[PDB]
Point group: C5
Chain length 324, copies 5
C-alpha cells in the first residue's frame, strides 16, 4: 500500500512543479458571475521509489495508471464544476524517477466581476488549486502559467496572467490569477447609441408648439421606445448588492428625464386647452431641460471618471481556506 | 470484509465531527425554487483498527482510497443533483487512527422561498445530510459550519448560517440552515420605477380635455406600455399555490386602474361626441381617480407592512425522513 | 458466482418490499410533457445465504457493496434520464439475512398532461419501475408510497399518490401513480385578465363616433396589444394532436372578434368618408358585437363545463411492456 | 480471456436477434435538426460455452455482469449523445446457453427534417446501431421494432416504424427507420391566422380616403404588427441551405406587399398634399392590390401543392459507414 | 506491467494510422464561438507482442478491453467537452499483431469564426488531437479524414476537410482542419429585407408635407420599428474585439440616418409652427437624404467588397502546444 503514499523528501516537503497552460477562456457570464476556462496541468515531481536500473529494462520511460502511484489530487474551490477530459490519466516515469502527469480539464469558476464600469468592466479572476488530502509540511507547489489562449476574438480579453503560492498555508495550494477586460461593442451599439439618440430626439421634439397634437404622441412613442430599451438593458445586466453598474443608474436618470418631459408636456397642454402663461412655462422648461440634459451628461462623465467600487471582501477571500 | 464496517465505539454510537465550509452560493432560481451551493465537508472520526505502530512505519500519516475503509455515505434529500468534485477521494489516517475525509461537492437543493415581499424576500434554506446506510444507534454527527463564501456581490446575501442535529432520529443526519435575503436593485429599477412613472403619467394625462383627440391615443399608448411591463413582471416571477408575491397583485391593481381610466375616457368622449354633463363627469372621475391612486398606494403600503405568508408546512417538513 | 444470483424462495417468487418516498416534484414542463421528481427507494428482501451466526460475528448488521450481492436492477420506462445520487450504494444485512437497500434517485419521467382545462389542468403521472433482468416467476414487488414532499409552494400540487402492481405481468414491476393539479395564478393574471380588459376596452371604444379619427388608431392599438398578448400565450403553451387547451381557441376567437371590429370600423369609416347609412350600420354592428361578445363568453363557459379530452391511449399505455 | 470473445457459429456468422421497443419520442428540435427518443433493446443470442448441466446447478437461469461475457457493443452514428440508463447491465443465461441482454437507453439522434411543408412537415428519421468492434463475417443482426410509445399527445406523431439490415455491409449494423408527421396547431394559430387577419385588415384599410390622416397611421401600425409577427416566425424556424420552408417565403411576400401598400399610400398622400390624379391612382392601386393579394394566395397554394424538396443526399447517407 | 507500454518500433517511432470520419457537425454557435461535431476515430497500429500462433488459437481476431493493452490517449485542446460514446471500448487484434481501435466521440471545439461577412461568413475550424502522455520520438500519427456527414441541410456547410501533422513537434498530434460557410437565409430575410424596406419607407415618407401631423407619427413609428429590429440584430450577433461583423455597423448607420431624418422633420415642423424657409430646408434635406442613402448603400457595398478581417493570431495559435 506504500506505492500510493506521497514520496518523502526528508525534512523539507516534497516539491511538485506545476505548469499551467490556459488553452481558452470561452464563457464569461456576468449574470451568473462565472468564468469558464480550459486548462492543461503538467505536474512534475521526483519519486525515487519508482526508479529502475536501465540494464534490466531497456525502456527509458514507462506509463503507469492514475491509481498505481501517488498523484496530487487537485481541487478547485471557485470551480462550480470540473470536467477532467481524461477520466483515467497516465503518469510518465523515466529511469531517474521523475514523474510527469498531464491533466486536461474544463472548469467554470466563480469570478467576482467589478461591473461598475460596464461595458468596459475590468475584473480579476482566480483559480485556486488545493491539495486537500495533503498538508503543507509534506507537499509544496511551484506554479508556472503559460498564456496559450486559442480564441482571442472574444468579448473579454485575458491580458495579465500570473501564478502565486499563498504564504502561511496549511493545505498546499497554488493560485492562478488572470485579469479580464471587456472590449465588446455589442452593448454600446445596442443600448447607449439608441439611448442617446432617443434623448436627443426628445430634446428636439421639445421644440414643437405646446398646442400641437403631434407633440404628445411623439413624446409618448419615444417614452415607450426608451422603456423597451431600458427593459432590455436591465434584463441584460445583473444586480449587485452595493457596487452596481453605472449604466443602470444613467438609464434610470434618462428615463426619469423623459417621463418628466412627457408629464410637463401633457400637463401644460391640458392647462392651455382649459402669449398665454403655459407657453412661456413650456419655453422655460425646454431651456431648463436642455441645460439639465447637458448637466446630467457632464455629471455622469465626472462620476464615471471618479467612481469607486468599494465592495468589501467576501468572507472566503478575507479568510482563505487552509490558512494560518 | 470487516475493514469496510463501521467502527464500534461500544454502547454509545460512533461520533463523526463534520466541518462544513460554504464556498459559494451562486444560483438562486426562484422560478425553480432552487438554491445551488458549493460545500467542503471535513469528516473526522476515530478508527482504532487502522492504527499502526510508529516504529514499523516511519510515516505519521497515510492516504487510503475511498473504498478501502469505512466512510459515511452522505445523502442530501433536498438536493436535485449532487456533483462530487472528487470521484475517488482519499482518507488521511494518522498513527492514532484518526481518519479525516475531505469532500468537495456542488449541489442544487430545493429551498422554499418566501416570495411574499419580493424583491426584498427573506427565506430559509436547508441542506440535510443523511447517512441512510447507517442507524442512529451506530453513527452520530457533530456539525460545524464556517462561512467561507467567496462571492459576496450577488443578488442574494447569505447572512445567517448554522448547523443542527434533529433530535429523536432513526437515520443519523445533520442539517445546515442558512438564510437568504434579496438585495438586487434590478427588479426595482426594471419594474417598479417604470410602473409608478406610467401611473403618474396616466394621472397627469387625465387632465387633458375630454374633447381632445390627443388624449385617447395617449391613454392607449400608456396602457400598451404598462401591459408590456406587466407581462415582463409576471414572466419574471413564479406563482405559488397560496402565498404569492404582493407585486403581482399590486401590478394587477394598477393595470385595472389604467384600464378603468382608459375605458372612462373613451366612453365619455364617445358620449360627448354623440358645460356638458360628460365633462363634469370626467372632472369628477379625475378627482376620484387621483384619490383612488393615493388610497391604493397607502393600502398597498399597509398590506406590505402587515402581510402574513402563512403557507402550511410541506409533508416532508412536517414529517422529516428518518424520525421517531 | 452464486453470491450475485437472486435468492430462491422456493416455488413462489422472491418477495421484495419497496417503500417509496417522494421527496419533491420540482419541475413540471408542459412544453416537454415531462415531470421531474426525487425519490427514495427502500427495498427489503430476505437472503438466507447471507445469514451468519451471532456468536462468530458480534456485529448485528453489516454493509456490503452494491456488486457483492444480488440487488434488483430497477429501470423506469417513462424516465428520460435517471440520476442515482449514490453511484456505489451499500446494502445493510442483519444476522437473519434481511437485506435493506436505500437508493436516492432523481428522474425526469414522461407524463401525459391533460391540458384541456389549462391553467387548471388535472393530470395523472406514472413512474413504472421494471426489473427487466428478472422474471415474474422469480421476483415479486410490494410497493408502498409515502408522501414526503418537501416543497409544497409550487405551481403544481401533488395531492393523490398510490402504488400498484399490474397483474398478469412477465417482467416484475411496480407502478407509482400520482395526480397533479395546477394552482398557479401566473397564467391567469398574465393573460386572461389583460385579454378580458382589452376586449372590454374594444367594446367601449365601439361607442366612439364613426367619423372620429381617434377611433381607428384606438382600435388598431388595441389590436396590436392583443396580438402581442396572443403571441405570448401561444408561445407559453404547447400544442397537442387532438386535445388542445381551450384557452388557445378562446384567445383565437377573441382575436378574430377584435379583427372583425377593427375591419368593420375601418370599412364603415372609409365608406362614410367617400343620418347616413354607414352610421346606422355601425350602431347595429355595435349592438350585435356586444351581444356576440356576451354570447361567446357564455358559450365558452358552457364548453369549459362540458368539454371532454378524449385522446386515445398511447400504444405504450394500451399495451404495457412485459405483459401477458 | 476467451470468455469475452464472440461465440463461433461456424462458417456462418453469429446471429443476434434484436427487439427494439420505442418507449417515447419526446423532443423534436427542428432548430437543431435533432430527435430524442428512449429505446429498449432486447438482444438474444446463443453462447454454448455458457451452458451448464441442470443436475449440478438447480437454477434454470443465471445473471452475469456486463463484462463477464461477450456482449455486442452497439454504437449509434446519428446520436449526438447516448445515455445508457444501466451503467452495468446484466445478461440472463439459461441452461441451454441462450443469452438475453436488456439495455435501456436515451438518445438524441440527428434527423434530416423535410421542413418544406411546415408546420405540416413529414420527415424520415433513422437510428443506425453499429457493432464497430466486430465484422459482418462474425456478427449478424435480426432487428424487430415494437411501437410502445407512451406519449401520443405530442406535436410530432410517429406513425410508421420499421427495421432493416443494410445489405453488403462490412460492419454489422441494423437500422430503425421511423416517420414523423407534425400535427401541432400552435404554429398555425400563432402565425398564419394573425398574418391573414393583418393582410385582410390592410386590404380593408386601403379603402380609406387618400386625404385622411387616419390612414397612414393605420397602415404603419399594421406594418409594425406584421414586422413583429414576421420576426417571431423567422426566429421560430431554422434555415436550410436549399430546401427552406415555404412559410418564410410566404411571409416575406406578404411583408413586401404590406410595405408596398404603405409606401404607395404615403407617396400618394404626399403628392396630393403638394378628382385629382393621385386619388384615381390610389383607387387603381387598391384594385390591383386586392387582385394581387388573391393571386398571391392562389399562387402560394399552387406552389404548396406542387413543391419539391429536392435536397441532395448527404455524404454520410450517400456512402453509409461500413459498406462495400 | 509491460503489456500496457507503447510498442517499440526500434530507432523510428511507432506509427499509428488514424482514419477520421466526420459523422455530423450539428451545432455552430457563433455567440459562444463553438462548433460541435461527432467523430469516429479508427486507429491502427502494430503490436508484435500480442501476436499468437494460429495453430494454438483457431480465432483469427480477438477483442481486448481498453485497459488490457497500450492505446493512445488522445486529447483535444480546442474541445470544451469530449463525450466518448464508448466508456470501455475494445481493441481488435488479429494473429499478426495489428491492433485496431474504434472510438466514437462527440466534441464541442472552439472555432475562431471570421464573422466579418455575416451572414455569409467563412471560417476555418480545427480539431487538434494530442497524445500528451507520449513523445514524438515514440509515437507518430498518420491522419486521414473521410467526409461522411449525415446532415447536409444545415445553416453551415462543411465543404473542405483535410488532415495534417504539424512538423517539429514534441507531443505527437494530428490536426483535422475543416472549412465552414454560412448559407442560412434566416438572418437575411429576418433582418436585411425589413431594414431596407423600413429605410425605403422612411425615404418615401420624407415626401410628406412639413406641416402635416401625419408625418411625425409616421417617422417615429418607423423609428421604433427599426429600433426593435436593430435590437433583435445586435442580440442575434456576438461582438469581437477588433473584427466585428459589418452588419452591425451598417444597421447603426441606418439607425443614425433614421434618427437624423426624424430629428430634422420634428425640428423643421416646430420652427414652421412657431414659401417659408423651413419648407425649402425640408426639400433640400430630403434631396440630400436620398443622395446620402444611395451613397451609404454604395459605400457599404464597396467596404464589403474590400474589407479585411486582420485580427492577430491568438497566443495558442501563434505558439501551438508541444512545439519546438
Ligand atoms: C526537497 O526540499 C528542497 C528544499 O525545500 C528542494 O530544493 C529546492 O528545489 C528548488 C527547485 O525549484 C530550488 O529553487 C530551491 O533552491 C531548492 N532549495 C534547497 C535548500 O535546495 C528539493 O527540490 C526538494 N526535493 C523534492 C524531490 O521535492
Ligand atoms: C463514543 O461515545 C462517547 C459518548 O457518546 C463520545 O464521548 C463524547 O465526545 C464528545 C466530543 O465531541 C463530547 O462532547 C462528549 O462530552 C463525550 N461524551 C462522553 C460520555 O464522554 C465519544 O466521542 C465516542 N467515541 C468515538 C470514537 O466516537
Ligand atoms: C415466499 O412466497 C410466499 C408466498 O408468495 C411469501 O409469503 C407471503 O408474504 C406476504 C408478506 O407481505 C404475505 O402478505 C402473504 O400472505 C404471504 N403468502 C403466503 C402463502 O405465505 C413469502 O413472503 C415469500 N418469502 C420471501 C423471502 O420472499
Ligand atoms: C448460425 O448460422 C445459421 C445460418 O446463417 C443460422 O440459421 C438461421 O437462423 C435463422 C433464424 O432467425 C433462420 O431464419 C435461418 O433460416 C437460418 N438459416 C440456416 C441455413 O439455418 C443460425 O441461427 C446461426 N446460429 C447462431 C447461434 O447464431
Ligand atoms: C517504424 O518506422 C518506419 C519508418 O519510420 C515505418 O515505415 C514507414 O511506414 C509508412 C507507412 O505509412 C511509409 O509511408 C514509410 O515510407 C515507411 N518508412 C520506412 C523507412 O520504411 C514503419 O511503419 C514503422 N513501423 C511501426 C509498427 O510503426
Ligand atoms: C486586480 O489586480 C491588480 C493587480 O494585479 C490590482 O491593482 C487591482 O486592485 C485588482 N482589482 C481588484 C478588484 O481586486
Ligand atoms: C427562518 O428562520 C428564523 C430563525 O432562524 C425564524 O425566525 C423564521 O420564522 C424562519 N422563517 C421561515 C419561513 O421559516
Ligand atoms: C386519473 O386518475 C383518476 C383516478 O385515479 C381517474 O378517475 C381519472 O379518469 C384519471 N384521468 C386520466 C386522464 O387518466
Ligand atoms: C420517407 O420514407 C418513405 C417510405 O418509407 C418514402 O416514400 C419517402 O420518399 C421518404 N422521404 C424522404 C425525404 O426520404
Ligand atoms: C482558411 O483556410 C484557407 C486555406 O485552407 C486559407 O486560404 C485562408 O486564409 C484561411 N482563413 C483563415 C481566417 O485562417
Ligand atoms: Zn527523469
Ligand atoms: Zn474602468
Ligand atoms: Zn490522529
Ligand atoms: Zn420582508
Ligand atoms: Zn433481519
Ligand atoms: Zn378541470
Ligand atoms: Zn435458453
Ligand atoms: Zn406535405
Ligand atoms: Zn493483422
Ligand atoms: Zn466573404
Amino acid at each position: 500500500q506504500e506505492s500510493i503514499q506521497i514520496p518523502n523528501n526528508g525534512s523539507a516537503p516534497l516539491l511538485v512543479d506545476v505548469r499551467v497552460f490556459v488553452s481558452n477562456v470561452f464563457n464569461v457570464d456576468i449574470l451568473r458571475y462565472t468564468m469558464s476556462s480550459m486548462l492543461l496541468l503538467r505536474l512534475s515531481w521526483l519519486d525515487t521509489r519508482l526508479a529502475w536500473n536501465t540494464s534490466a529494462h531497456p525502456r527509458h520511460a514507462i506509463t503507469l495508471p492514475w491509481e498505481s502511484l501517488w498523484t496530487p489530487r487537485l481541487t478547485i474551490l471557485e470551480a462550480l464544476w470540473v470536467d477532467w477530459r481524461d477520466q483515467s490519466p497516465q503518469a510518465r516515469v523515466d529511469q531517474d524517477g521523475h514523474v510527469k502527469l498531464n491533466l486536461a480539464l474544463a472548469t467554470e469558476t466563480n469570478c467576482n466581476f467589478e461591473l461598475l464600469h460596464f461595458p468596459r468592466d475590468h475584473s480579476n479572476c482566480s483559480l485556486s488549486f488545493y491539495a486537500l488530502s495533503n498538508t503543507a509540511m509534506e507537499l509544496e507547489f511551484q506554479a508556472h502559467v503559460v498564456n496559450e489562449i486559442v480564441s482571442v476574438k472574444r468579448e473579454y480579453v485575458v491580458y495579465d496572467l500570473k501564478t502565486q503560492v499563498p504564504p502561511q498555508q496549511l493545505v498546499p495550494c497554488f493560485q492562478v490569477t488572470l485579469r479580464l477586460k471587456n472590449t465588446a461593442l455589442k452593448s454600446i451599439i445596442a443600448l447607449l447609441v439608441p439611448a442617446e439618440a432617443l434623448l436627443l430626439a426628445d430634446v428636439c421634439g421639445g421644440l414643437l408648439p405646446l398646442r400641437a397634437i403631434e407633440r404628445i404622441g411623439y413624446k409618448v412613442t419615444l417614452l415607450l421606445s426608451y422603456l423597451v430599451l431600458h427593459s432590455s438593458l436591465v434584463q441584460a445586466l445583473p444586480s449587485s448588492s452595493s457596487c452596481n453598474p453605472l449604466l443602470i443608474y444613467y438609464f434610470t436618470i434618462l428615463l426619469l428625464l423623459l417621463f418628466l418631459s412627457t408629464i410637463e408636456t401633457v400637463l401644460l397642454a391640458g392647462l392651455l386647452a382649459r402669449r398665454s402663461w403655459p407657453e412661456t412655462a413650456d419655453r422655460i422648461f425646454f431651456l431648463v431641460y436642455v441645460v439639465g440634459v447637458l448637466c446630467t451628461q457632464f455629471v455622469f462623465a465626472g462620476i464615471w471618471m471618479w467612481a469607486a467600487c468599494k465592495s468589501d471582501a467576501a468572507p472566503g477571500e478575507a479568510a482563505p481556506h487552509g490558512r494560518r
